[PDB]
Ligand binder design. Structure first.
Ligand code: HEM
Ligand code: HEM
Ligand SMILES: C[C@H](O)[C@H](O)[C@H]1CNc2nc(N)[nH]c(=O)c2N1
Ligand SMILES: C[C@H](O)[C@H](O)[C@H]1CNc2nc(N)[nH]c(=O)c2N1
Ligand SMILES: CN(O)C(=N)NCCC[C@H](N)C(=O)O
Ligand SMILES: CN(O)C(=N)NCCC[C@H](N)C(=O)O
Ligand SMILES: [Zn+2]
Lengths: 407, 411
């Protein structure tokens, strides 16, 4: 019932008691571990509302107070009467911050208490959604001095009036299947790009075309909007030592803004809740650029470095990987756009884990996601045992809206 | 029940049915995943089902399930258990058991090779001197002048738990570690505790950076005895770099034969507490972990200093740059000396091919992602993108406590 986690580099041992508060299921059983799998009514709602309100009133040191009991009765009366309830602004902000705090896949959680919460629960149309999103992009970007933010659209009601951002992130690049057989742009975004074109987007058919927003308000058919170009901060990628790197024609955007997840607070479901922080360098340099199914640039870079690509044991892929990641970090830093390297971020996470174990009794963490995708063992998280479990409030995956929407 | 795993790079989906034959527990529950935790005398009653399960597996593998030979063997083992409290495996069953323990080892990336394993049966061994001779023969066979051959040596099984055979070394060949009065370490810090034990037992330590440890061998529950492996049998490789001529003056070398000697082999409920096994290295084991872990030889700074990298801020990725060069040097050095080694790209590519084959022919391949993904360049290897299912099949290799923690000293 009490669990220990050890760091095998420092011998530091921490005791986890927070897992006992966990409610949701992991997908593992005593017989099988699914740790590497990517995607493993009124009666329902009151216990969830109560669980949340209890944690909230405990957090402001007013547990069992008159104000606690009164809010519990108020919400109970509201669920019994309306089949749902509304969060106070204080509860919404607490809930959003804790959904981030609880995000076991996120290495950036030392930042969790510093989150700007934009309450968009008064939004009614897709044009309104576009306005809120531009404002979030502008605030979060802050001319390169990035600030963490979330924008929260109205909660699910009966499930036929869902707010959704159809985009997987606020800013991403289009992908196009060519007659050639190859893919132009970002292959990750081929299906969604097709949906936009189908809905009438005039695609430029280039390598780095910022996708338009496809926004769905109140369960209505989604609508297209272009983010003002002047609000999308991009960074041309160059190398501090290699003059030729700039001629690859690479760029990336500064603001990573996940827009397809569902925020659950006190049993309420916020299906449109785009949130943004800043990039860890490996996200762009390792995954976005070097995944075989992404921009897949290792070959081109290695050829420009004149490495021996005849044999895997020359480690040519590894050498070009490091250089690409050096160029990503250098380019963002030179343009004064916030970015964190994987050494700095993982060091910060270990400190955050220690803080959470000390002050909260634990920190749910998914090692498979937390360890960076290059140089794993030279970062301290590789040597850190972690326990993964699901706490609420939470960010959850949800099915893509085009599979589910009724046109 | 069927379980699917997807490869997110190729979209290949595989279906696992083998997990149904799993009996042992993982450490995980419906409420918690323990997938990153390093470490999460039998009765007659518990023994016969284990033996039966194993013999059924063995006779099925040889296409003799339900034959008179199968039935007679079950009867013979049942009689032997009821009579003597235990039983003896036939040579064929021992070979099959050892190969399958390897096949089932979810943390092993090298399993494409599982059916090619030389099994040395040492169950007639009675003394530590006998163990030493067996171990020297294993080392010489496995080394094969650099053309490494996988092998296992299997000493007598556990009886009452008071007469265990144990190799006290964690690997047959490893370097000594010495804690200095000023708090620094000479040699390999991983082996400081064991080095102190050896010195206590009478070893005269050279006190250098790469001293091959003596073997410390326990036969039949007796106190362990020290033996020096003949130096001519210990193949080592001086580490140099193909471009950087200063690399050799770091004074680095490593041994060619990785030979894990502290695990327990379980076959049909029998426990083989001394079962050293060896293959060949994947380069990252040495170049990433052994050389660059902060708690091991910790060479990153010295290498980066010699490369004249910008070390003022982590975001120059100086550690990452030095790491790749060290790993190039290790692969270069072994290949140049004609000592078998595999790079992490080749090894992971082969593992994926093995895994897909296992799914098709066996219905699954238990695999621990946390261990299978290499400790550098994770996502440019195919295993990073491969969903895996981790579960425990028997026969198996298991951890056991260090023998100095449990040994009853006779004097
Ligand atoms: C402040 C800077 C932040 C950094 C450096 C950071 C870092 C990261 C990284 C590197 C990942 C893995 C992403 C991937 O591999 O695709 C991640 C995942 C995640 N982060 Fe953060 N994060 C930050 C802010 C935030 C914020 C503000 C939130 C929510 C308010 C958040 C919630 C999450 C969630 C829910 C995931 C899992 C996403 C998924 O499963 O695809 N993070 N974080
Ligand atoms: C033939 C070449 C082989 C290669 C390249 C290979 C590769 C590896 C690697 C890289 C690891 C991780 C080791 C670590 O991080 O400390 C490992 C683990 C392991 N391998 Fe292999 N292996 C090979 C042969 C064998 C053989 C012959 C056996 C047994 C018969 C075996 C059984 C195991 C086991 C039980 C582990 C888990 C070790 C632990 O938990 O500490 N492997 N393998
Ligand atoms: C199959 C495996 O779960 C998958 O490739 C994971 C591994 N770790 C990851 N880690 C992060 N941070 N992001 C990812 O997309 C992934 N992908
Ligand atoms: C805490 C974590 O489980 C631990 O550091 C693991 C991670 N993955 C590993 N993978 C391999 N192959 N070998 C190891 O020693 C480790 N160590
Ligand atoms: C949440 N956020 O701040 C962040 N750093 N990453 C979210 C995911 C971004 C994605 N991995 C990408 O490379 O675009
Ligand atoms: C099993 N074997 O062949 C192997 N490749 N590795 C076993 C463990 C070796 C260990 N990682 C080391 O670096 O010495
Ligand atoms: Zn698990």
């Amino acid at each position: 019932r009490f669990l220990k986690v050890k760091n095998w580099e420092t011998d530091v041992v921490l005791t986890d008691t927070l897992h006992l508060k966990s409610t949701l299921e992991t997908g593992c059983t005593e017989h099988i571990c699914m740790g590497s799998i990517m995607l493993p009514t009124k009666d329902q709602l009151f216990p969830l509302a109560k669980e949340f309100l209890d944690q909230y009133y405990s957090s402001i040191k007013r547990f069992g107070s008159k104000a606690h009991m009164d809010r519990l009765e108020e919400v109970n009366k509201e669920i019994e009467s309306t089949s749902t309830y509304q969060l106070k602004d204080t509860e919404l902000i607490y809930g959003a911050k804790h959904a981030w705090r609880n995000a076991s896949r996120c290495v950036g959680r030392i930042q969790w208490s510093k989150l700007q919460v934009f309450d968009a629960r008064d939004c009614t149309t897709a044009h309104g959604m576009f306005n809120y999103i531009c404002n979030h992009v502008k605030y979060a970007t802050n001319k390169g001095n990035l600030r963490s933010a979330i924008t929260i659209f109205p909660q699910r009601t009966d499930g036929k009036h869902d707010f959704r951002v159809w985009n997987s992130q606020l800013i991403r690049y289009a992908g196009y299947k060519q007659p050639d057989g190859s893919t132009l742009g970002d292959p990750a975004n081929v299906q969604f790009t097709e949906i936009c074109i189908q809905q009438g987007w005039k695609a430029p058919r280039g390598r780095f075309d910022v996708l338009p927003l496809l926004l769905q308000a109140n369960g209505n058919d989604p609508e297209l909007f272009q983010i003002p170009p002047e609000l999308v901060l991009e960074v041309p990628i160059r190398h501090p030592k290699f003059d030729w790197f700039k001629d690859l024609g690479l760029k990336w955007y500064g603001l990573p803004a996940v827009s397809n997840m569902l925020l659950e607070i006190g049993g309420l479901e916020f299906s449109a809740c785009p949130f943004s922080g800043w990039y860890m360098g490996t996200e762009i340099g390792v995954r976005d650029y070097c995944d075989n199914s992404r921009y897949n640039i290792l070959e081109e870079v290695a050829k420009k470095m004149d490495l021996d690509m005849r044999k895997t044991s020359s480690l040519w892929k590894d050498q070009a990987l490091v250089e690409i990641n050096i160029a990503v970090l250098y380019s963002f830093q030179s343009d004064k756009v916030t970015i964190v390297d994987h050494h700095s971020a993982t060091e910060s996470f270990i400190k955050h884990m220690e803080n959470e174990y000390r002050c909260r009794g634990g920190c749910p963490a998914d090692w498979v996601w937390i360890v960076p995708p290059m140089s794993g063992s030279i970062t301290p998280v590789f040597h850190q045992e972690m326990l993964n479990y699901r706490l609420t409030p939470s960010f959850e995956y949800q099915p893509d809206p085009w599979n589910t929407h009724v046109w």
